[PDB]
Design a binder for this molecule. Structure first.
Ligand code: FES
Ligand code: FE
Ligand code: H2S
Length: 104
Protein backbone atom coordinates (compact mmCIF):
# COMPACT_ATOMS: atom_id res chain seq x y z
CA UNK A 1 0.00 0.00 0.00
CA UNK A 2 1.69 3.17 -1.24
CA UNK A 3 0.43 6.64 -0.38
CA UNK A 4 1.14 9.52 -2.76
CA UNK A 5 2.95 12.23 -0.79
CA UNK A 6 3.96 14.95 -3.25
CA UNK A 7 6.38 15.88 -6.02
CA UNK A 8 9.98 15.65 -4.82
CA UNK A 9 10.51 19.15 -6.21
CA UNK A 10 7.79 20.47 -3.90
CA UNK A 11 9.80 19.63 -0.79
CA UNK A 12 12.80 21.79 0.04
CA UNK A 13 15.64 20.06 1.90
CA UNK A 14 15.09 20.18 5.65
CA UNK A 15 11.29 20.34 5.42
CA UNK A 16 8.57 18.00 6.65
CA UNK A 17 5.25 16.77 5.26
CA UNK A 18 2.41 15.21 7.23
CA UNK A 19 0.63 12.28 5.58
CA UNK A 20 -2.77 11.11 6.80
CA UNK A 21 -3.77 7.44 6.74
CA UNK A 22 -7.15 5.68 6.72
CA UNK A 23 -7.87 3.98 10.03
CA UNK A 24 -4.56 4.98 11.60
CA UNK A 25 -2.37 7.78 12.96
CA UNK A 26 -0.66 10.10 10.44
CA UNK A 27 2.92 9.84 9.20
CA UNK A 28 5.65 12.43 8.79
CA UNK A 29 7.87 12.50 5.71
CA UNK A 30 11.20 14.28 6.09
CA UNK A 31 13.55 15.44 3.36
CA UNK A 32 17.18 15.31 4.47
CA UNK A 33 19.30 16.62 1.63
CA UNK A 34 17.94 14.62 -1.30
CA UNK A 35 16.97 11.67 0.91
CA UNK A 36 13.41 11.05 2.11
CA UNK A 37 12.44 9.28 5.33
CA UNK A 38 9.15 8.57 7.06
CA UNK A 39 8.06 7.76 10.61
CA UNK A 40 4.85 7.95 12.60
CA UNK A 41 4.10 11.66 12.98
CA UNK A 42 3.14 11.31 16.64
CA UNK A 43 5.86 11.49 19.30
CA UNK A 44 6.05 8.31 21.38
CA UNK A 45 6.47 10.33 24.58
CA UNK A 46 3.27 12.34 24.32
CA UNK A 47 0.45 13.68 22.17
CA UNK A 48 2.67 15.83 19.98
CA UNK A 49 3.16 16.23 16.23
CA UNK A 50 6.75 15.73 15.10
CA UNK A 51 6.03 17.48 11.80
CA UNK A 52 5.45 20.56 13.97
CA UNK A 53 8.90 20.09 15.45
CA UNK A 54 12.38 21.04 14.26
CA UNK A 55 14.30 18.90 11.78
CA UNK A 56 18.01 19.33 12.51
CA UNK A 57 19.97 17.25 10.02
CA UNK A 58 18.27 13.86 10.21
CA UNK A 59 17.06 14.25 13.80
CA UNK A 60 13.52 15.48 14.41
CA UNK A 61 13.15 17.48 17.61
CA UNK A 62 9.76 17.18 19.27
CA UNK A 63 7.92 20.44 20.02
CA UNK A 64 8.21 19.44 23.68
CA UNK A 65 10.58 18.36 26.45
CA UNK A 66 13.72 18.48 24.34
CA UNK A 67 12.93 15.00 23.07
CA UNK A 68 14.12 13.87 19.65
CA UNK A 69 14.36 10.92 17.27
CA UNK A 70 16.55 9.90 14.36
CA UNK A 71 14.26 9.90 11.31
CA UNK A 72 16.13 7.09 9.56
CA UNK A 73 15.89 4.53 12.36
CA UNK A 74 13.07 5.97 14.47
CA UNK A 75 15.30 5.56 17.52
CA UNK A 76 15.27 8.13 20.35
CA UNK A 77 18.05 10.70 19.93
CA UNK A 78 17.43 12.64 23.13
CA UNK A 79 15.81 12.20 26.54
CA UNK A 80 13.01 11.83 27.59
CA UNK A 81 12.19 9.73 24.50
CA UNK A 82 12.64 5.97 24.99
CA UNK A 83 10.15 4.28 22.66
CA UNK A 84 11.23 4.05 19.00
CA UNK A 85 9.00 5.49 16.28
CA UNK A 86 7.70 3.17 13.61
CA UNK A 87 9.53 3.74 10.33
CA UNK A 88 8.03 3.57 6.85
CA UNK A 89 9.66 2.92 3.49
CA UNK A 90 9.78 5.88 1.11
CA UNK A 91 10.33 5.71 -2.65
CA UNK A 92 10.63 8.33 -5.38
CA UNK A 93 9.27 7.34 -8.80
CA UNK A 94 9.41 9.84 -11.65
CA UNK A 95 9.68 12.83 -9.32
CA UNK A 96 6.78 11.71 -7.13
CA UNK A 97 7.29 10.78 -3.47
CA UNK A 98 5.43 7.72 -2.20
CA UNK A 99 5.32 6.30 1.33
CA UNK A 100 4.31 2.83 2.50
CA UNK A 101 1.13 2.83 4.56
CA UNK A 102 2.41 -0.09 6.62
CA UNK A 103 5.29 -0.03 9.11
CA UNK A 104 8.49 -1.95 8.39
S1 FES B 1 5.90 14.77 23.81
FE1 FES B 1 7.63 14.52 22.45
S2 FES B 1 9.45 14.36 23.78
FE2 FES B 1 7.68 14.58 25.13
FE1 FE C 1 3.62 25.00 13.32
S1 H2S D 1 3.53 24.56 10.54
Amino acid sequence: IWLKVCAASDMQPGTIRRVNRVGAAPLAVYRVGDQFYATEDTCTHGIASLSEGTLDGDVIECPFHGGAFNVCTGMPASSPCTVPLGVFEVEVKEGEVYVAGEKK
